[PDB]
């Protein structure tokens, strides 16, 4: 189906406690496959998925060199941000960047992304056209003008249309037996009395991949979004995911409730009920 590759950088300043930290992670769809932490003793880009370990030394050594340099770049970027925002060196600050490419089912590039944030808010972003920028404030407009004149967008466009799409197709092949395999959810409903007149119906979905999923509760066929506790989709620790949705129901009305599960690994939407038997 559709696939994507994303890189997430985090650069954190910690004045009076140590040098700024740089953490970077790589994902294919919802599977982490590489990582780098400047706080490690021997900072190295390391593998986090089995299918990537087959790459040779030039790959690991080149990624390590790039990240060591990237860390120094975001060290400078953190100082430059203090200037733009007129902030002291006493505060801790964070810069984030996430960028990557989206393949369509046809395997040709569908969209590229490159966005950056400062202290949790938008800073600057590459627009869809991969040629122009969107700046969130006056400080980012300084960065924009520099990147416009330095023709940065063009170097990024070239990476997103080229190496990013190519490596993503390369990765997708090396680990197709897990990455291009969808794992449907194993589902069921549980019953938990709250009192002698109320019970919680919980709809479970376990061990699915990818993470995208839709759980809803219906009563007599009517959605109950307003009364549904939906937890955030969570990692199981083995690269599959879990989610549940619960509704508080009055004793006796249980069988009027239905759970509907949508997941791309499913032949059809499922419709579940509590099966007390």
């Amino acid at each position: 189906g559709s696939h994507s590759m994303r890189y997430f950088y985090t650069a954190m300043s910690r004045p009076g406690r140590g040098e700024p930290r740089f953490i970077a992670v790589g994902y294919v769809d919802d599977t982490q496959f590489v990582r780098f932490d400047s706080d490690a003793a021997s900072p190295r880009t390391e593998p986090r998925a089995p299918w990537i370990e087959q790459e040779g030394p030039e790959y690991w050594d080149g990624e390590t060199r790039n990240m060591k340099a990237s860390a120094q770049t975001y060290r400078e970027n953190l100082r430059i941000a203090l200037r733009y925002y007129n902030q002291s060196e006493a505060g801790s600050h964070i810069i984030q960047r996430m960028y990557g490419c989206d393949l369509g089912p046809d395997g040709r590039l569908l969209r590229g992304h490159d966005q950056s944030a400062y202290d949790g808010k938008d800073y600057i972003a590459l627009n869809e056209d991969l040629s122009s920028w969107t700046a969130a404030d006056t400080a980012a407009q300084i960065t924009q003008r520099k990147w416009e004149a330095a023709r940065v967008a063009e170097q990024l466009r070239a990476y997103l249309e080229g190496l990013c799409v190519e490596w993503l197709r390369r990765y997708l092949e090396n680990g197709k037996e897990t990455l291009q395999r969808a794992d449907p959810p194993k589902t069921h409903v549980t019953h938990h009395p709250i009192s002698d007149h109320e019970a919680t119906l919980r709809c479970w979905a376990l061990g699915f991949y990818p993470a995208e999923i839709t759980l809803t509760w219906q009563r007599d066929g009517e959605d109950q979004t307003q009364d549904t506790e939906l937890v955030e989709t969570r990692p199981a620790g083995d690269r599959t995911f879990q989610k549940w949705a619960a509704v508080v129901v009055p004793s006796g009305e249980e069988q009027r409730y239905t759970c509907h599960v949508q997941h791309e690994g499913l032949p059809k939407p499922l419709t579940l009920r509590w099966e007390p038997h």
Binding site: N66, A150, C164
Partner: peptide, 9 residues
């Protein structure tokens, strides 16, 4: 493969 950073903020 990561992208190489070509400019500062």
């Amino acid at each position: 493969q990561a992208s190489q950073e070509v400019k500062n903020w």
